[PDB]
Design a binder for this molecule. Structure first.
Ligand SMILES: OC[C@H]1O[C@H](O[C@H]2[C@H](O)[C@@H](O)[C@H](OCCCCCCC3CCCCC3)O[C@@H]2CO)[C@H](O)[C@@H](O)[C@@H]1O
Ligand SMILES: *C(=O)/C=C/N[C@@H](C(=O)O)[C@](C)(COC(=O)CCCC(=O)O)S(=O)O
Length: 265
């Protein structure tokens, strides 16, 4: 594999789309690689990690409990609800909803949680409170990943998303238990985690949340590193490419391969 930046460029050439990428030390925030890092990209399902950061902040403040059971109706369900559709009779706890949203990609679970934090506007306000002045959520599942060209709704930048994830996971804005919980949800991803592990060399840590959208939109927010340590935050977004899902996945994996082969920078 070529160098990370060289691979990123090749991916844009091959996909005819824009790639946005940040690689950042988790402990310190040292930026190692930045490409279109201040450009906007649709967050897609990656917003679910920030959503559950807001939930945990409410738990820390005593305004929420992960134990609290929410009962909902079939009319509340949106497209793709593999866990929430199973609990119309008995409900789900707030913590179960975060687990379902982040680890199983459950969309109704995300919407239920979004309501508890005051909707897209409430989540955006939370982002402003932690000093993210760029990321914005405007819509609910499933409209939020429409990825219209030039539409600023439901977008982040690689730099903003990396910084925000670092804040939630490490900055002590969340309690120790809450930081640990958010991390464990990412470790437990079942949508892409097991697949990614299957292709990572021995010794590489992965935790992640992935997303997909229209017009080629695809993305991942990840913790990655050798010696089984979450050494770096890696955020990669793609937009405005007509390529197959397989090829978009392969190109992102190829950027990962370049990072792995050329880690010591
Ligand atoms: O010399 C470094 C390594 O080179 C290869 O490893 C390959 C591996 O066989 C391949 O499957 C992977 O694909 C990349 C898979 C990435 C999966 C997604 C990555 C995520 C992670 C965080 C955000 C970016 C995307 O690349 C590495 C590096 O070439 C060798 O197989 C391995 O023995 C060796 O230790
Ligand atoms: C998040 O990125 C979800 C995007 N795609 C879904 C959507 O538009 O709501 C689909 C319904 C596909 O479903 C999934 O990707 C399942 C996992 C969702 C997640 O990662 O949280 S649409 O057909 O693309």
């Amino acid at each position: 594999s070529p160098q990370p930046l060289e691979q990123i460029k090749l991916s844009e050439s091959q996909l005819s789309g824009r790639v946005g990428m940040i690689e950042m030390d988790l402990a310190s925030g040292r930026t190692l690689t930045a490409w279109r890092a201040d450009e906007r990209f649709p967050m897609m399902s990656t917003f679910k990690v920030v959503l559950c950061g807001a939930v945990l902040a409410r738990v820390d403040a005593g305004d929420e409990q992960l134990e609290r059971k929410i009962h909902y109706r079939q009319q509340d369900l949106v497209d793709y609800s593999p866990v929430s559709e199973k609990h119309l009779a008995d409900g789900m706890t707030v913590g179960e909803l975060c687990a379902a949203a982040i680890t199983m990609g459950d969309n109704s679970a995300a919407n239920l949680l979004l309501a508890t934090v005051g909707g897209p506007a409430g989540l955006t306000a939370f982002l402003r409170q932690i000093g993210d002045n760029v990321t914005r959520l405007d819509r609910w599942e499933t409209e939020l990943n429409e990825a219209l060209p030039g539409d600023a709704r439901d977008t982040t930048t690689p730099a903003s998303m990396a910084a925000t994830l670092r804040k939630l996971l490490t900055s002590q804005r969340l309690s120790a238990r809450s930081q640990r919980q958010l991390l464990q949800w990412m470790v437990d991803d079942r949508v892409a985690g097991p697949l990614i592990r299957s292709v990572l060399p021995a010794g590489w840590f992965i935790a992640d949340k992935t997303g997909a959208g229209e017009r080629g939109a695809r993305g991942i927010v990840a913790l990655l590193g050798p010696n089984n340590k979450a050494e770096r935050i890696v955020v990669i977004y793609l937009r405005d490419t007509p390529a197959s899902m397989a090829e978009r996945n392969q190109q992102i994996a190829g950027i990962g391969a370049a990072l792995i082969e050329h880690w010591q920078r």
